[PDB]
C-alpha cells in the first residue's frame, strides 16, 4: 500500500527524526563542512586550521 | 586641605597643594597578521579570525 515516492519520503523523514533524537552528544560538538567535496577516495586527509597564537 | 575653622579665613585658600599623577600611553598594541582566502570565504570564518585577533 506504499508507492515509491512515499517510500523515499517516509524513510528519509524517519531517519532524520530518529537520528536527531537519540544523539545528544553529537549535537553538542561543532559541525564542520569542508569545501573539498571529494568523491569516494576516503575523501582526503582534510587538514583543518587551528587558532593562531 | 587642612581643617579651616572660624569666621575669618584670610589668606587660607592660598598655599593648598595640587598634586598630579602622570600616565604614558606609549605605543599602540597591534595584532599584525595576514588574511587568507579561507578566512574571507564567508562571514562566519572572517568573524572567527577577527575574534581570534581581538
Q: Which residue has the cell 533524537?
A: A21
Mind giving me the DSSP string for A1-53?
Answer: ---HHHHHHHHHHHHHHHHHHS-HHHHHSPP---S----SS------------
Which residues are CB-neighbours of B37 under 8 A, at least 6 positions away?
Answer: none
- Chain A contact for B50 (CB, 8 A cutoff): no
CA–CA separation, B49 and B32 (whole Å): 12
CA–CA separation, B1 and B17 (whole Å): 8
CA–CA separation, A51 and B15 (whole Å): 59
Q: At how many Å resolution was this determined? A: 2.6
Q: Is B39 exposed, middle or buried (0-12, 13-18, 19+ CB in 10 A)?
A: middle
Among A33, A48, A52, the strongest candidate for a mutation testing the B interface, having the largest count of B CBs within 10 A, is A52
Here the cell at position A17 is 527524526
Cβ contact (<8 Å) for B41 and A35?
A: yes
Method used for this model?
cryo-EM
Here the cell at position B29 is 598594541
CA–CA separation, B35 and B46 (whole Å): 9
Tell me the backbone φ, ψ of residue B14, rounded to 5 degrees: -75, 155
CB atoms within 10 A of CB B33: 11
Element (H, E) at B42: none
Cβ contact (<8 Å) for B38 and A51?
A: no
Here the cell at position B25 is 600611553
Number of H helices, E strands in chain A: 2, 0
Among A32, A48, A49, the strongest candidate for a mutation testing the B interface, having the largest count of B CBs within 10 A, is A49
CA atoms within 13 Å, Cβ hemisphere of B52: 15
Amino acid at each position: 500500500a506504499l508507492n515509491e515516492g512515499q517510500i523515499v519520503t517516509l524513510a528519509v523523514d524517519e531517519i532524520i527524526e530518529t537520528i536527531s533524537a537519540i544523539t545528544p552528544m553529537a549535537q553538542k560538538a561543532k559541525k564542520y563542512t569542508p569545501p573539498a567535496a571529494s568523491m569516494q577516495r576516503s575523501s582526503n586527509t582534510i587538514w583543518m586550521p587551528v587558532e593562531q597564537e | 586641605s587642612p581643617t579651616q575653622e572660624g569666621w575669618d579665613l584670610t589668606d587660607k585658600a592660598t598655599g593648598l597643594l595640587e598634586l598630579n599623577v602622570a600616565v604614558n600611553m606609549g605605543e599602540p598594541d597591534n595584532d599584525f597578521f595576514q588574511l587568507r582566502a579561507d578566512d574571507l570565504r564567508d562571514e562566519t570564518a572572517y568573524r572567527r579570525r577577527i575574534q581570534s585577533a581581538a
